[PDB]
Amino acid sequence: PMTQSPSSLSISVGDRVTITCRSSQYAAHNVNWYQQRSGKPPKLLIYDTSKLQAGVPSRFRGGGFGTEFTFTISSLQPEDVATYYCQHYEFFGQGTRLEIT
Amino acid sequence: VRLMQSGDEVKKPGASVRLSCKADGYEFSDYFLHWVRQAPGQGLEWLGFIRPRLGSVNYSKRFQGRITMTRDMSINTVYMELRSLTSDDTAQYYCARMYDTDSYKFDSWGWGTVVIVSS
Amino acid sequence: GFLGAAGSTMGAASMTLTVQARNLLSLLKLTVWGIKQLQARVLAVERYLRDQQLLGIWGCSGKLICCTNVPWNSSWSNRNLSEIWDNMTWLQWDKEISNYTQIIYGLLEESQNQQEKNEQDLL
Amino acid sequence: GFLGAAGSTMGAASMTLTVQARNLLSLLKLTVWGIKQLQARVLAVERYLRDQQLLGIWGCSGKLICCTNVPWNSSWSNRNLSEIWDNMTWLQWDKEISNYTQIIYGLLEESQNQQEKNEQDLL
Amino acid sequence: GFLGAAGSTMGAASMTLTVQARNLLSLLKLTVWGIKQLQARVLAVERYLRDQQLLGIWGCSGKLICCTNVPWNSSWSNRNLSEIWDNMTWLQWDKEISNYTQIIYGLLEESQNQQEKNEQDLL
Amino acid sequence: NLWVTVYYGVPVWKDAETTLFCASDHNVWATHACVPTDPNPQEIHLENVTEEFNMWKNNMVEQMHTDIISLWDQSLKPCVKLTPLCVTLQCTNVTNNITDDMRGELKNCSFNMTTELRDKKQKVYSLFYRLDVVQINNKEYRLINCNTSAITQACPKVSFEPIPIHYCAPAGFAILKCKDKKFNGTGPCPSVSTVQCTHGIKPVVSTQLLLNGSLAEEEVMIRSENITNNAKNILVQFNTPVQINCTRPNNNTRKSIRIGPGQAFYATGDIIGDIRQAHCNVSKATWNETLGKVVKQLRKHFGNNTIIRFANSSGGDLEVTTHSFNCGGEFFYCNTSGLFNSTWISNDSITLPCRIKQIINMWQRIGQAMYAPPIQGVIRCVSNITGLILTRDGGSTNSTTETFRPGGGDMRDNWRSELYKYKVVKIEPLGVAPTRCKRR
Amino acid sequence: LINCNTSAITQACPKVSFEPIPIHYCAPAGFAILKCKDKKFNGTGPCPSVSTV
Amino acid sequence: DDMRGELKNCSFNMTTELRDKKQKVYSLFYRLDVVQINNKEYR
Ligand SMILES: *[C@@H]1O[C@H](CO)[C@@H](O[C@@H]2O[C@H](CO)[C@@H](O[C@@H]3O[C@H](CO[C@H]4O[C@H](CO)[C@@H](O)[C@H](O)[C@@H]4O)[C@@H](O)[C@H](O[C@H]4O[C@H](CO)[C@@H](O)[C@H](O)[C@@H]4O[C@H]4O[C@H](CO)[C@@H](O)[C@H](O)[C@@H]4O)[C@@H]3O)[C@H](O)[C@H]2NC(C)=O)[C@H](O)[C@H]1NC(C)=O
Ligand SMILES: *[C@@H]1O[C@H](CO)[C@@H](O[C@@H]2O[C@H](CO)[C@@H](O[C@@H]3O[C@H](CO[C@H]4O[C@H](CO)[C@@H](O)[C@H](O)[C@@H]4O)[C@@H](O)[C@H](O[C@H]4O[C@H](CO)[C@@H](O)[C@H](O)[C@@H]4O)[C@@H]3O)[C@H](O)[C@H]2NC(C)=O)[C@H](O)[C@H]1NC(C)=O
Ligand SMILES: *[C@@H]1O[C@H](CO)[C@@H](O[C@@H]2O[C@H](CO)[C@@H](O[C@@H]3O[C@H](CO[C@H]4O[C@H](CO)[C@@H](O)[C@H](O)[C@@H]4O)[C@@H](O)[C@H](O)[C@@H]3O)[C@H](O)[C@H]2NC(C)=O)[C@H](O)[C@H]1NC(C)=O
Ligand SMILES: *[C@@H]1O[C@H](CO)[C@@H](O[C@@H]2O[C@H](CO)[C@@H](O[C@@H]3O[C@H](CO)[C@@H](O)[C@H](O)[C@@H]3O)[C@H](O)[C@H]2NC(C)=O)[C@H](O)[C@H]1NC(C)=O
Ligand SMILES: *[C@@H]1O[C@H](CO)[C@@H](O[C@@H]2O[C@H](CO)[C@@H](O)[C@H](O)[C@H]2NC(C)=O)[C@H](O)[C@H]1NC(C)=O
Ligand SMILES: *[C@@H]1O[C@H](CO)[C@@H](O[C@@H]2O[C@H](CO)[C@@H](O)[C@H](O)[C@H]2NC(C)=O)[C@H](O)[C@H]1NC(C)=O
Ligand SMILES: *[C@@H]1O[C@H](CO)[C@@H](O[C@@H]2O[C@H](CO)[C@@H](O)[C@H](O)[C@H]2NC(C)=O)[C@H](O)[C@H]1NC(C)=O
Ligand SMILES: *[C@@H]1O[C@H](CO)[C@@H](O[C@@H]2O[C@H](CO)[C@@H](O)[C@H](O)[C@H]2NC(C)=O)[C@H](O)[C@H]1NC(C)=O
Ligand SMILES: *[C@@H]1O[C@H](CO)[C@@H](O[C@@H]2O[C@H](CO)[C@@H](O)[C@H](O)[C@H]2NC(C)=O)[C@H](O)[C@H]1NC(C)=O
Ligand SMILES: *[C@@H]1O[C@H](CO)[C@@H](O[C@@H]2O[C@H](CO)[C@@H](O)[C@H](O)[C@H]2NC(C)=O)[C@H](O)[C@H]1NC(C)=O
Ligand SMILES: *[C@@H]1O[C@H](CO)[C@@H](O[C@@H]2O[C@H](CO)[C@@H](O)[C@H](O)[C@H]2NC(C)=O)[C@H](O)[C@H]1NC(C)=O
Ligand SMILES: *[C@@H]1O[C@H](CO)[C@@H](O)[C@H](O)[C@H]1NC(C)=O
Ligand SMILES: *[C@@H]1O[C@H](CO)[C@@H](O)[C@H](O)[C@H]1NC(C)=O
Ligand SMILES: *[C@@H]1O[C@H](CO)[C@@H](O)[C@H](O)[C@H]1NC(C)=O
Ligand SMILES: *[C@@H]1O[C@H](CO)[C@@H](O)[C@H](O)[C@H]1NC(C)=O
Ligand SMILES: *[C@@H]1O[C@H](CO)[C@@H](O)[C@H](O)[C@H]1NC(C)=O
Ligand SMILES: *[C@@H]1O[C@H](CO)[C@@H](O)[C@H](O)[C@H]1NC(C)=O
């Protein structure tokens, strides 16, 4: 299972954000990140913690290989307000809510 | 690739609900289909997946016995039936499509079907 | 590159040969395209093998430029060497020797055999 | 036997080459197995022919070990000869030089052509 | 012409070899005759390639008559050279030696490799 | 002074893909068309070599799958198309000498066929298993694969027995075999041996239990691309074989029907004697010992103190819910709930009631059915369960128990248990190396 | 029709001709065909007069 | 006015998946794909 942290954080537009994804079992690189807009179905941005799915802007990036994974969006935008979910195999993680300060 | 689900449902406690998920735009034999439920204000939870190729299923240990997934190749749909509904099953159920067996990649998700279980 | 010296002078064309020598050779489903590809591969292989066999019969295998001990009858060509190698290319040279080529090959192989036998006599 | 010296030292592996050199080449019914056998035969023939053509372009046809006149830029490999030929085999050698092969090949053929022309000048 | 010296003496047959050496190699529709022709072409190509590979392994590529440094055990044949090369042809010669061929071939290749290594030592 | 030197024949290879032909020592698989393998196979052991094998990314398995499908199609092509059979059958239930386990499983269906004459009909009866007929709303039934695919009768002179086939790479290619007896299936293999042909792989078609396979040597092996992943089948290879006895006690009689010029349809006549359910028998003690051995080698990836539970298949078609196989010319679908009904915490035979189908939709291809003709007499079979194809249930609740249920269906997993140790490589006999020599 | 209970009849195709056109069986390269020119050759045994073709 | 009679609503009997049962089904055929036989009868 995942221990994605923090629960939420207030971030100004254009600021760099980081979301740790401390896992409980060896996940290697098979960790993906989903962006769920409020109400809309979740949308997948990063798979294998490095590669970027087509149609997703390059501002999104990921890292980590062991039991710790990081998610960064570099320059935040008003359309980046959503919830972000870790996903190793079947298990998802507690979401991270982005709030504009 | 488009995955259109069924219509928002309301069931009494103890009843069984059969959600559907029609998939089009891709060959309905190569990619597994998962059912991911989300409680209101809670994180995503995985229910189980089905291989449309031969109907092989694999359910989560929490929802095992109460859930059963089938497929219709001609109609091109995946059906999920949940039995013995209780109060906390009020949720939005999604059907995702795994791209590759390794590195579970839920490319396309359905619109969502809220099942409301209440008296 | 390939066939670049086609219009170049006889000597300059003879200077470069590897660039157009490598390109003489380079699942299976029996569809329309698969059978055509198989025929193309077999044809290329057999043409290269025929050319190499002709080269090796004359004792010139592995040599792009190989000399021979056979004489050259003046009937084949009375043109001087300077104009042949300085004001003329390989195409018209083949054109004005073509019908003679067929006999020269024979002389070639004969000489080789004789030479080979001579070697077996000397060594 | 075949590929027996794969883990053996560079010099020892270079000593024995015929045992793994013979095995590089060795009715028709259009069934599932027949087409596979035909493809296998054609593939083996064309691979052997490509290898022999590359050998013969560099003036090394018929020679398992052939020397060349081109220089070796130290950027390709700075490792000493003793450790190369005494504490290491051919596989890891191929891995570290696989990216400089093409240019080397070109140099090879160029020298041969130059070398060939020189005999045509001298002989 | 082709195979004309089959009944001729060993020396006379050895004198002429090119005439029966050239003839060792010389759209697609998968009909009966098309598939038979494709099989024939592939078979001829692979047989010629096998023969040339065997010749080149022994360091005799491009030479119809090639000598070797390996010894000849008297158990293979005690017949004198004069009668072998003057009162008998190639067929019955092949009949009485066909069961010593393989080992001979091995000796051949071994010598070549040794010789090649010696050359790499000397040059 | 140092210069280049080219060596031909150096032992250098790179992983590649090519066509591997067949060698063997009528049949559906064209074993006769295969080249004769050498009586004494030649295998060269390699010293001090490490190669990275990957059974799940192997290409030889895909080529084998394609070859088996192609052989099946080419064996089914020149034989009787059963399009006239897709007609309204008037069926009853057979009740003459049927036990309690086969109540209504067979149907006595009488129907009109075209005879050898175009303008004349023919009222003929036959016996169809309940799985091969669907009701239309004596009653009216129709063959199950009449609204999806065209049935081609399995051709009576061909045999389905898996004759071993050797996959030989062409000249210029070699096959590296991983002789390491502790090779889990994905990673470096210290002990690599070069070969030209495979060890006579039997094209055995089965779903839940690997039959007549190649066994491990040292202990039972658990292979999986990702044990943590729940979408990856877990292959289990036994070190000792577990015998399974298969039987169809019915004494079937084959009856020929002329449905056209030359074309003949082989139906099931009246069964002579007593009608009894086809069944399997596996030694209880041997199966329990093998399951214990599997659990012992299965706790390594999940740690000690964990509960290992084997339950039956969770759902799907009849191919994945039941152990499906083919022997004696007949296809059995055996309910293996008795085998996987155990929990493990840190003479008697398990009898499996099997069902028989004649409309076989092999290779999960919707559009090409297949009618296996009845086999005369009583069919008995003896096989070894070489391995299992398990699947781990997903999710993670408070309990630490793990439940493994039989899987299958994808024959690539079936043929990956024989090609796991093999890899195909292309030789690169040209190599450049420093030397102090120059041409004169 | 006599062949209605044993085989399926395929009509002989009207544009094709059954006249036997002579065909020459040529061996591939690397092979030869020995023809026995002995005019008293009964069919099984040695042939003193052999000609390659 | 430009497509007066160019399309034909043709109803006809087809064999169904069952050999002994028929099926009365309609379709739309362009005028160039049907010729009259001498609603009317076309083929
Ligand atoms: C794992 O591996 C095992 C062993 O390799 C395998 O078990 C074997 O299965 C095969 C299935 O084909 C069995 O072969 C059949 O055996 C029966 C019985 O054989 C015994 O009895 C006969 C006399 O009745 C003896 O002569 C014989 O030596 C045995 O003692 C045979 O009756 C079968 O013959 C028919 O099929 C052959 C192949 O098609 C034909 O060549 C033969 O002529 C028969 O067909 C014809 O005759 C029929 C009756 O007249 C007729 O109805 C047909 O239409 C046709 O005209 C066949 O040989 C073999 O015995 C099994 N061996 C053991 C030890 O059990 C497992 O199946 C395998 N598991 C898998 C693959 O999952
Ligand atoms: C793996 O192992 C499990 C072990 O339980 C099997 O589950 C059993 O499957 C059988 C076969 O389907 C079930 O038997 C059927 O029961 C039906 C009624 O079930 C009701 O009650 C159960 C709880 O007891 C509920 O879960 C269920 O939803 C129903 O409310 C009957 O209607 C069926 O009758 C049919 O067969 C009989 C046979 O004689 C005929 O007479 C009838 O006319 C009709 O055709 C049938 O009896 C059984 O209930 C299941 N058990 C449980 C606990 O659920 C799995 O099937 C097995 N999976 C495999 C082998 O793949
Ligand atoms: C089958 O055998 C394989 C080889 O033994 C197994 O692969 C190894 O599995 C172990 C345990 O699962 C892994 O150990 C972990 O290693 C990481 C560090 O990762 C290292 O390897 C990766 C490979 O990409 C590399 O990129 C990193 O830089 C590291 O060098 C540790 O952080 C963990 O704590 C743990 O020790 C091995 O990494 C892994 N190796 C390889 C090459 O995959 C495989 O798991 C076996 N499969 C089964 C089903 O048993
Ligand atoms: C070919 O014919 C078969 C048999 O008639 C078809 O399978 C059947 O398809 C129907 C739907 O058209 C299924 O009905 C459904 O049953 C479920 C319960 O299982 C019920 O909840 C639904 O409301 C619906 O009524 C039926 O179950 C199914 N039968 C089997 C044995 O699978 C098949 O679809 C046809 N092929 C086609 C149309 O391409
Ligand atoms: C299946 O049904 C057929 C036809 O009803 C049975 O065959 C006939 O059974 C009657 C019984 O009175 C006999 O008189 C006939 O001689 C049988 N043959 C024919 C061609 O009519 C057959 O016995 C049934 N099979 C069962 C019940 O297993
Ligand atoms: C075979 O065809 C015959 C003739 O079409 C069927 O017999 C008819 O069945 C219908 C429906 O029950 C009756 O209305 C007719 O009176 C019957 N005619 C005759 C001459 O019997 C017969 O049922 C068909 N066979 C089967 C098994 O259905
Ligand atoms: C499979 O096992 C069953 C049960 O152990 C065997 O059933 C017995 O079979 C014998 C032989 O016909 C009968 O005399 C007994 O009455 C049967 N007993 C029961 C309880 O069924 C069966 O023979 C075995 N068959 C195979 C092929 O292994
Ligand atoms: C499966 O069947 C085989 C025989 O087909 C059984 O093994 C033989 O059993 C007989 C009878 O006791 C012995 O005489 C033989 O010594 C046994 N071994 C053989 C023939 O190799 C076997 O026990 C059965 N397995 C089951 C029922 O699980
Ligand atoms: C597979 O076999 C198991 C046990 O051998 C069957 O389970 C029994 O099914 C019957 C039929 O409904 C029930 O009456 C019993 O209560 C069940 N017992 C147990 C322990 O599960 C199962 O139904 C079979 N599955 C099939 C035939 O599809
Ligand atoms: C072509 O003709 C068919 C005749 O069946 C028309 O389809 C029917 O039209 C009637 C009109 O009253 C409807 O009641 C039916 O429901 C229709 N369907 C069937 C199956 O009968 C069809 O509309 C015509 N198409 C045209 C004129 O474009
Ligand atoms: C489909 O077949 C039916 C029956 O063969 C046709 O209906 C018949 O039409 C003829 C011609 O007018 C009548 O004499 C019969 O009385 C009709 N029989 C029945 C049962 O209706 C029908 O016309 C066919 N369909 C089409 C489109 O031609
Ligand atoms: C899954 O397997 C692949 C290939 O063997 C490997 O690269 C990856 O690290 C594995 N992941 C886990 C979580 O075991
Ligand atoms: C025939 O068997 C079926 C089950 O396949 C059953 O539903 C039906 O009632 C039976 N009819 C009888 C016994 O008359
Ligand atoms: C699990 O227990 C076995 C003994 O049954 C032991 O050999 C092994 O080291 C244990 N594994 C652990 C403690 O991780
Ligand atoms: C099956 O029936 C045939 C013919 O009656 C008989 O010869 C044979 O012995 C029977 N087999 C069994 C196992 O009863
Ligand atoms: C596998 O089964 C066959 C046939 O029953 C048998 O001959 C063979 O010995 C079995 N395998 C082993 C390892 O015993
Ligand atoms: C139907 O259309 C055709 C032209 O395709 C025409 O000749 C005929 O008169 C029309 N029949 C009517 C309008 O009744």
Numbering used by the authors:
A (entry chain N): 3 to 91, 96 to 107
B (entry chain J): 2 to 52, 52A, 53 to 82, 82A, 82B, 82C, 83 to 100, 100A, ...
C (entry chain D), D (entry chain B), E (entry chain F): 521 to 546, 565 to 661
F (entry chain A): 33 to 57, 66 to 138, 147 to 185, 188 to 306, 309 to 321, 321A, 322 to 397, 411 to 504
G (entry chain E): 193 to 245
H (entry chain C): 148 to 185, 188 to 192
Quote the study that presented this structure, word for word:
Broadly neutralizing antibodies (bnAbs), capable of neutralizing diverse HIV-1 strains and subtypes, represent promising tools for immunotherapy and prevention. bnAbs target conserved epitopes on the HIV-1 Env trimer, including the CD4 binding site (CD4bs), glycan-dependent sites at the V3 base and V2 region, the gp120–gp41 interface, the membrane-proximal external region, the fusion peptide and the silent face. The highly conserved CD4bs is critical for virus engagement of host cells. VRC01-class members, encoded by the immunoglobulin heavy chain gene segment IGHV1-2, include a five-residue light chain complementary-determining region 3 (CDRL3) and are characterized by high somatic hypermutation.
In addition to 04_A06, we identified and structurally characterized 01_D03 and 05_B08, two phylogenetically distinct VRC01-class bnAbs also isolated from donor EN02. In addition to contacting highly conserved residues, the insertions and interprotomer contacts of 04_A06 and 01_D03 contribute to an increased amount of surface area buried on Env by antibody binding.
